Amino acid sequence: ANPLYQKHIISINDLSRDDLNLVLATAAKLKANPQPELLKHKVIASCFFEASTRTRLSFETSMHRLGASVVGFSDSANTSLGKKGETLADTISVISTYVDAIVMRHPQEGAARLATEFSGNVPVLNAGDGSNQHPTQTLLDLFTIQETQGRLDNLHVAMVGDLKYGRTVHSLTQALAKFDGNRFYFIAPDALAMPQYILDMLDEKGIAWSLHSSIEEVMAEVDILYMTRVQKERLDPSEYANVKAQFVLRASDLHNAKANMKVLHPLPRVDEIATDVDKTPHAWYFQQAGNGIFARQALLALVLNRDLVL
Amino acid sequence: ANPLYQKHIISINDLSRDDLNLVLATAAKLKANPQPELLKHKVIASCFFEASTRTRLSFETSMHRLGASVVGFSDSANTSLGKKGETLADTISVISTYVDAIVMRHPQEGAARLATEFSGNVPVLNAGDGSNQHPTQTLLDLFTIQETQGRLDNLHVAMVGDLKYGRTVHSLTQALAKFDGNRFYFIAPDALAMPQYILDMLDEKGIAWSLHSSIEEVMAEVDILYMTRVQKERLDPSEYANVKAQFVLRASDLHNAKANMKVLHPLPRVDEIATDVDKTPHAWYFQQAGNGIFARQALLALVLNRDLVL
Amino acid sequence: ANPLYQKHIISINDLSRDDLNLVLATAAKLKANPQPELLKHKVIASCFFEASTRTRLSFETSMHRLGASVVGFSDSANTSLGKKGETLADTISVISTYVDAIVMRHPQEGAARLATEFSGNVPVLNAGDGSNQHPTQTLLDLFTIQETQGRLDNLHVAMVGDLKYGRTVHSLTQALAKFDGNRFYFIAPDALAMPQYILDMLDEKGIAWSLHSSIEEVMAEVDILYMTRVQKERLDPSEYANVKAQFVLRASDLHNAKANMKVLHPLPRVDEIATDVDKTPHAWYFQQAGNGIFARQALLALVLNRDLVL
Amino acid sequence: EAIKRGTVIDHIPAQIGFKLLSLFKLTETDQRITIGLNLPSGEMGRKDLIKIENTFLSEDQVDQLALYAPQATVNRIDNYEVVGKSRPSLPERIDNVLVCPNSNCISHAEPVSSSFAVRKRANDIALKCKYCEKEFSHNVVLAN
Amino acid sequence: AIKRGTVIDHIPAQIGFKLLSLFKLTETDQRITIGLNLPSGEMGRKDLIKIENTFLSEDQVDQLALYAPQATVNRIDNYEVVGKSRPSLPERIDNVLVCPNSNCISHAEPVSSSFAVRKRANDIALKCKYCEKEFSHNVVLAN
Ligand SMILES: O=c1ccn([C@@H]2O[C@H](COP(=O)(O)OP(=O)(O)OP(=O)(O)O)[C@@H](O)[C@H]2O)c(=O)[nH]1
Ligand SMILES: O=c1ccn([C@@H]2O[C@H](COP(=O)(O)OP(=O)(O)OP(=O)(O)O)[C@@H](O)[C@H]2O)c(=O)[nH]1
Ligand SMILES: O=c1ccn([C@@H]2O[C@H](COP(=O)(O)OP(=O)(O)OP(=O)(O)O)[C@@H](O)[C@H]2O)c(=O)[nH]1
Ligand SMILES: O=c1ccn([C@@H]2O[C@H](COP(=O)(O)OP(=O)(O)OP(=O)(O)O)[C@@H](O)[C@H]2O)c(=O)[nH]1
Ligand SMILES: O=C(O)C[C@H](NC(=O)CP(=O)(O)O)C(=O)O
Ligand SMILES: O=C(O)C[C@H](NC(=O)CP(=O)(O)O)C(=O)O
Ligand SMILES: O=C(O)C[C@H](NC(=O)CP(=O)(O)O)C(=O)O
Ligand SMILES: [Mg+2]
Ligand SMILES: [Zn+2]
Ligand SMILES: [Zn+2]
């Protein structure tokens, strides 16, 4: 079986550089040559306990492009967990007797890991667990960085905005740190800084990183400018000063930008990216969202189909 | 390609008499001869930002009868537009990188037209935008009028109820006005009258229309009695006197009705049609709802399949 | 007539040193021998548009100890301003045809000032207007300081807590600055610092003030330690990190205090003063409250009587 | 006084010259502008006049004036010379400057530019919103 | 060159158009001449407004000191300058200004705004008659 067959996909921290490349290599192939029936006779649960547009709809679209059926909910309010007091554990215990894989998003950190302890032989794919991990975001992100830079090694990467609560940048930083010679610029209000467990991990691998108070400092040297939304629904009331985007990228900020540089954003954006950026050749957040289809197809393929696709 | 291939379907005002007949002709054919795989390998978004029973379920049913897959939501509250502040434009910008067509209903007028400006080459089908247009309602309505009258020309058509806010009658009146010699009776409280842009359009084509204060005046001469619901969720608080149906059709009102005449209603009805009407041979609102399948199949076929069906 | 007869009492900024000494001398006398019939045949409005325990109850008790009657409300929700949309202006315009004086507290800065523009010959007494001024609080504060310290000049005064929104310390700092050689110590979080307009006034009069990040820095130095509550009902959401008392006074922090030092607090306290302070000889916030009676009696007698002999 | 190069908008009816400055944001430039209000004309009696240096108006831009000053004359000037004269003709559309009066139109909530179809209706000018498709008299459709 | 009326000279660039709106100057039948972005000996660029048979209200001249401190007001009679002065700054400004304190009572109630004006260094301070707060005329004139 391929290395990822029947595997839980919970945290980038559990995956190796080889696993990530495997996903990417499979994504390339299916994009070039769709296999509309690879997952025929699979039924897959799509269980979203907090809000989603991109992650849920692209996952479900991926399932249909590969021929799988889909069941689930986009809202927990009409599940028996929502109305009758049922635990998440019992919820996973019954659903795992129905389907071939469980895609789940949840507002509490650790939820995906928990489901893993009740799902038997049914793989769980983490579509995001509180402010912890978002591994499939990282997969599409890597695919996008690869697509536009030609490599994943020796890059200058700025991450801007809410780094404390961004499950996106927790996962992505851990992933890039598995590759050689990448450099990090972290642009956050002090209250929403990148957590210490990420920084320690970087120091352990001798990876270079530094803090900056503006985008303009690093604009000249960045290959990837990764903008994020302030995670207001995760914020403590004591952190309410940071609700407003502290850094707003506009088209004029891009004057000194390298021709190769792309602006990425896991979306949705509020105002951290002004609309005038949309038309500039650096804007790639929509192309990025679209790459979600290829990354998520690949992931489903590898988890549910024992043989390497080709 | 057929005239409607890859076209946006936003407003009846953008379509010609030939386009409408094309839909109807295709509907006839697929009803006679279902093509369960015509849209195999299509994935289609069903995006409903306000409530629906008939329009959403019949559209999705149409998609499945033709072999397409379906993704979407029936409620905006768990999209990233609902919880994280995302614009409709950004919502359409990402979804249009997933699917082959977007069916959308929205509470603001113009929403479908907007999506069209962000959806690239992905066609948008308007399942209703505020009190503006409801083009697929008009398609099924025309199919129904055709089915029961044998023609779409030279008919006596009464429209009753809330004409100001009825997207149904905005679309339908514009459509019938594209055919020859039809006559209109408008039966509305003054506060919810047919808007002036519809009346002007009729005057320009020299079409006959008049206002009436009761159903009974016109009962003798009508071929189609098109009843509507007061659109209370669209009403200004200053128009709250009209919440209650001003005109209630009952079985006894139908004594002087032509044998050929049908009672139509886009549904849901509140009390504007008493239940005793249901059993009379003039009642055709349920048959009408059922024709939604054939009109919507046809539309999907023409928009997503380059060749004329036969 | 006495200098305060028929005068509005809106802001300490409009009062002279002599005016304040007059209220204090008058208060001392009324505490010594009561004038239970001094305001006989007077009717006074007590209009509280936001919450109060000490200010409204001491005001009304003071009115009764002087023989006046009281009308009013402690909540605006059942006035015509609360249910029928009446302006504050019209409200003052009618009430001033009824009563001999108006005591008012209101959530908006300026409300008392505005009231004087509609109350004609009827005096207005500001019981607090938003985070602006609290002149009667300052009258009792000065009286208490005078009582315990024997003087109002050459004092070392520390004010602690929410100095930005504390209308208590705006009025009190202004009053103490009309006396000679007082020294101020401001101990506040940055986000809730003493406003610049108060500081500028201190600079213009050549009065020494300094900023300190802890109470202990000044404990050995102070004659008056004036604690305040965080004004949560006035914070901007951006200031929610300051909701909790930053400085907490406990009995153990008083080991190096001057023997004559008194701890004041206009009240209510939340957690900024621990209950183990209450039994120490430095606690004086309840005796201070108690003194509201004599300062408010004094103010009322001076405003409504041409002169008194005592 | 006379300009060497740019546009002169002559024969603006009275009380309109100032609206045109406000609406099309004509004063948002470093270019020298000269304005005459309430000038005698004889052809009109009273008129307004706007001269803008080193600035030119396309036929479409000239057309947007038809809503407000239909009998105006737009003179293109180069080298102290009138090198072209044109008159506002009613345009098909008016974009950006107006605001749809339907409160429930998607144009208010979203990052799009306003847009109306222009038609002659009776002795009035009717504007049809591209988005909500409702139609209004130009009089009741505000700017911004 | 007018015969009788007012010439507001040395108006800073981009201010000339504001004064036109704010003082409703163009709401007259009186002949008006306006030069925007004119070359200036002492300013480089300036705006200029001429109004025939018309003079400013004290209300209008008082407000002018805030908007354009360096502007000159010329009163002409019989083709000749008769009064020429820099507009004298008052100490109270009524009606035109809006307190930037959102919790000020002046926002909810039928009273005219009013501010006390003073200070040099850079900005000038406006003190609200109601809330007593003081602001830089920069923050206030960003109404
Ligand atoms: O630069 C300027 C300044 C002022 N004026 C002033 O405009 C007014 C008329 O000057 P005109 O040149 O427009 O006369 P006219 O006969 O051509 O007018 P029409 O019939 O075309 O309408 C006069 O008052 C003149 O001083 C200009 O024409 N140009
Ligand atoms: O070099 C120039 C030439 C012309 N102009 C300005 O062009 C405007 C029109 O120039 P015209 O000379 O064409 O006016 P006109 O009266 O002869 O013709 P009508 O348009 O009135 O029918 C005049 O107002 C003039 O001031 C300049 O400002 N500078
Ligand atoms: O008869 C006149 C005189 C003067 N003015 C107008 O009055 C304005 C000022 O009149 P001045 O032209 O006499 O002032 P000045 O430049 O000599 O000196 P400064 O004020 O610049 O220090 C000028 O801009 C002119 O246009 C008239 O309109 N008519
Ligand atoms: O009516 C008008 C129209 C235009 N102008 C134009 O204004 C420009 C300046 O005309 P000025 O008369 O103001 O020159 P100035 O040296 O006095 O300037 P200051 O130092 O006082 O600031 C001139 O170049 C002229 O073209 C007028 O003065 N008056
Ligand atoms: O919410 C974000 O800002 C980043 C990220 N966003 C997404 O995954 C896009 P969506 O919520 O539409 O699926 C997330 O963590 O949920
Ligand atoms: O709501 C109506 O009365 C008419 C019309 N009704 C429908 O389309 C039926 P439904 O809302 O169940 O899809 C509409 O405009 O939505
Ligand atoms: O509320 C405070 O903390 C200080 C001060 N407190 C009082 O006046 C006491 P009370 O609200 O019980 O009348 C005030 O400004 O209202
Ligand atoms: Mg000069
Ligand atoms: Zn509109
Ligand atoms: Zn104020």
In terms of Cβ atoms closer than 10 Å to its own Cβ (0-12, 13-18, 19+), residue B217 is middle
D86 & D119 share domain: no
Which atom belonging to ligand 4 lies closest to the Cα atom of E42? Answer: 20
D17's enclosing H/E stretch is helix D17-23
| Three-class SS of E94-108 | ECCCCCCCCCEHHHC
E19 & E82 share domain: yes
Spatial distance between the Cα atoms of A213 and D65, rounded to a whole number of angstroms: 48
**Cβ pair E133, C170 in contact under 8 A:** no
**Cβ pair A276, A282 in contact under 8 A:** no
For tokens 């990190």, the residue is C241
Spatial distance between the Cα atoms of B109 and D144, rounded to a whole number of angstroms: 20
**Cβ pair C226, C169 in contact under 8 A:** yes
Amino acid at D34: T
Last residue of a domain, which of D73, D91, D109? Answer: D91
**Cβ pair B249, B269 in contact under 8 A:** no
Domains and CATH numbers, chain C: 1-133+292-310 (3.40.50.1370), 134-291 (3.40.50.1370)
Contacts by A54-57, CB closer than 8 A, 24 or more apart: A54/A266, A54/A267, A54/A289, A54/A292, A54/B80, A54/B94, A55/A105, A55/A127, A55/A128, A55/A136, A55/A137, A55/A292, A56/A105, A56/A127, A57/B45, A57/B71, A57/B72, A57/B95, A57/B98
* E105:C13 CB<8 A: no
**Cβ pair A82, A91 in contact under 8 A:** no
The helix/strand/coil state of A71 is strand
E78 & E9 share domain: yes
| Residues in contact with A125: Cβ distance below 8 Å, sequence separation at least 6, in sequence order | A8, A9, A101, A102, A103, A104, A112, A135, A136, A299, A300, A303
What distance in angstroms lies between residue D10's CA and the mean position of ligand 1's atoms? 8
E68 & E121 share domain: no
Q: What are phi and psi of A10, to 5 degrees?
A: -105, -45
Beta bridge partners of A73: A47
Spatial distance between the Cα atoms of D20 and C228, rounded to a whole number of angstroms: 57
> How many residues belong to chain D?
144
**Cβ pair C156, C41 in contact under 8 A:** no
Strand C43-48: give its sheet, edge to edge: C69-73, C43-48, C101-106, C124-129
Q: CATH code at D19?
A: 3.30.70.140
Whether chains E and D touch (3+ CB pairs under 8 A) is answered by yes
CA dihedral C49, C52, C55, C58 (to 10 degrees): 110
Q: What are phi and psi of C44, to 5 degrees?
A: -125, 130
Spatial distance between the Cα atoms of C252 and C263, rounded to a whole number of angstroms: 14
Cβ of C52 closer than 6 Å to ligand 7, yes or no, is yes
Whole domain around residue E104: which residue ranges? 91-143
* B84:A286 CB<8 A: no
**Cβ pair E31, E105 in contact under 8 A:** no
Q: What are phi and psi of D3, to 5 degrees?
A: -105, 155
Taking CA–CA distances from E13, the nearest residue in chain D reads: D30
Spatial distance between the Cα atoms of B4 and B27, rounded to a whole number of angstroms: 14
The helix/strand/coil state of A167 is helix
Spatial distance between the Cα atoms of E134 and C256, rounded to a whole number of angstroms: 39
**A262-264 and A69-73 strand pairing:** unpaired
**Cβ pair B43, B98 in contact under 8 A:** yes
**B101-106 and B124-129 strand pairing:** parallel
User: Cis link prior to B268 (omega < 30° from 0)?
Assistant: yes
Please report the beta strands in B14-162, taking only residues with DSSP state E, as ranges in sequence order: 43-48, 69-73, 101-106, 124-129, 156-160
B168's enclosing H/E stretch is helix B167-176
% helix / strand / coil in chain A, to the nearest 5?
40, 15, 45
Amino acid at B64: H
| Residues in contact with B127: Cβ distance below 8 Å, sequence separation at least 6, in sequence order | B48, B52, B55, B56, B59, B103, B104, B105, B134, B136
The helix/strand/coil state of A209 is strand
Partner D contacted by E112 (CB < 8 A): no
Last residue of a domain, which of E52, E71, E90? Answer: E90
Interface test with B, best of A52, A54, A269 (most B CBs within 10 A): A54
D67 & D9 share domain: yes
Taking CA–CA distances from A289, the nearest residue in chain B reads: B94
B115's enclosing H/E stretch is helix B111-116
Q: What is the DSSP string of B123-165?
A: -EEEEEETTS--HHHHHHHHHHHHHHHS-SSS-EEEEES--SS
For tokens 């911004």, the residue is D144
The helix/strand/coil state of A68 is coil
Q: Within a 10 A sphere around the Cβ of E137, how many other Cβ atoms?
A: 18
Spatial distance between the Cα atoms of D106 and D98, rounded to a whole number of angstroms: 14
**The two structure tokens encoding residue B213:** 């204060």
Spatial distance between the Cα atoms of B293 and B28, rounded to a whole number of angstroms: 11
**Cβ pair A100, A44 in contact under 8 A:** yes
E82 & E125 share domain: no
Q: CATH code at E113?
A: 2.30.30.20
Which atom belonging to ligand 3 lies closest to the Cα atom of E41? Answer: 21
For tokens 């498709």, the residue is D133
Amino acid at A48: F
E54 & E110 share domain: no
- A64 in catalytic set: no
Q: What are phi and psi of A6, to 5 degrees?
A: 60, 20
**Cβ pair B228, B248 in contact under 8 A:** no
Task: Name which of D112, D121, D132 is nearest B132 (Cβ-Cβ).
Answer: D132
**Cβ pair A89, A114 in contact under 8 A:** yes
Which atom belonging to ligand 3 lies closest to the Cα atom of E81? Answer: 3
**The two structure tokens encoding residue B142:** 């025309």
For tokens 């009492």, the residue is C9
Spatial distance between the Cα atoms of A2 and A307, rounded to a whole number of angstroms: 6
Spatial distance between the Cα atoms of A188 and A272, rounded to a whole number of angstroms: 12
For tokens 């080193």, the residue is D54
- C31 in catalytic set: no
Partner C contacted by E54 (CB < 8 A): no
| Per-residue buried b or exposed e for D14-34, using 16+ beta carbons within 10 Å of the residue's own CB | bebbbebbbbbebbeeebbbb
CA dihedral B123, B124, B127, B129 (to 10 degrees): -160
E20 & E70 share domain: yes
In terms of Cβ atoms closer than 10 Å to its own Cβ (0-12, 13-18, 19+), residue C296 is buried
User: Cis link prior to A268 (omega < 30° from 0)?
Assistant: yes
Spatial distance between the Cα atoms of E131 and C265, rounded to a whole number of angstroms: 24
**The two structure tokens encoding residue B161:** 């109820």
D7 & D70 share domain: yes
**Cβ pair A25, A106 in contact under 8 A:** no
Report the sign of the C-alpha dihedral through residues C158, C164, C168, C169, in that order: positive
Q: Within a 10 A sphere around the Cβ of E77, how many other Cβ atoms?
A: 11
- A84 in catalytic set: yes
E17 & E72 share domain: yes
**Cβ pair A195, A170 in contact under 8 A:** yes
Give resolution in angstroms. 2.4
In terms of Cβ atoms closer than 10 Å to its own Cβ (0-12, 13-18, 19+), residue C268 is exposed
Spatial distance between the Cα atoms of A65 and A294, rounded to a whole number of angstroms: 10
Spatial distance between the Cα atoms of A112 and A55, rounded to a whole number of angstroms: 15
Biggest distance spanned by C-alpha atoms of chain C: 58
| Three-class SS of chain C | CCCCCCCCECCHHHCCHHHHHHHHHHHHHHHHCCCCCCCCCCEEEEEECCCCCHHHHHHHHHHHHCCCEEEEECCHHHCHHHHCCCCHHHHHHHHCCCCCEEEEEECCECHHHHHHCCCCCCCEEEEEECCCCCHHHHHHHHHHHHHHHCCCCCCEEEEECCCCCCHHHHHHHHHHCCCCCCEEEEECCHHHCCCHHHHHHHHHCCCCEEECCCCCCCCCCCCEEEECCCCCCCCCHHHHHHCCCCCCECHHHHCCCCCCCEEECCCCCCCCECHHHCCCCCECHHHHHHCHHHHHHHHHHHHHCCCCCC
- A56 in catalytic set: no
Beta bridge partners of C283: C263
Which residue numbers come right before each break in chain D (C to N over 2.5 Å)?
none
Closest-CA distance, D121 to chain B, in angstroms, reads 9
User: Cis link prior to B237 (omega < 30° from 0)?
Assistant: no
Element counts in chain B: helices (H) and strands (E): 10, 9
Q: What is the DSSP string of E8-57?
A: EEEEETTTHHHHHHHTTTTSSSS-EEEEEEEEETTTEEEEEEEEET----
Catalytic hit among A26, A55, A91, A144: A55
Last residue of a domain, which of D91, D107, D130? Answer: D91
The helix/strand/coil state of D60 is helix
Please report the beta strands in chain D, taking only residues with DSSP state E, as ranges in sequence order: 6-13, 33-40, 46-53, 73-78, 81-86, 93-95, 98-99, 115-121, 124-129, 135-137, 142-143
Spatial distance between the Cα atoms of A10 and A8, rounded to a whole number of angstroms: 6
Q: Within a 10 A sphere around the Cβ of A259, how many other Cβ atoms?
A: 6
Beta bridge partners of B259: none
D82 & D96 share domain: no
User: Which residues of D are less than 8 Å from B11 in CB distance?
Assistant: 133
Q: Within a 10 A sphere around the Cβ of B232, how many other Cβ atoms?
A: 14
In terms of Cβ atoms closer than 10 Å to its own Cβ (0-12, 13-18, 19+), residue C113 is buried
User: Which residues of B are less than 8 Å from D135 in CB distance?
Assistant: 195-197, 200
Method of determination used here: X-ray
Amino acid at C264: L
E97 & E85 share domain: no
Spatial distance between the Cα atoms of B216 and C21, rounded to a whole number of angstroms: 88
- B151 in catalytic set: no
Partner B contacted by D112 (CB < 8 A): yes
* C132:E134 CB<8 A: no
Closest CA to A286 of B112, B8, B87, B9: B87
Domain count for chain E? 2
Catalytic hit among B8, B29, B55, B269: B55
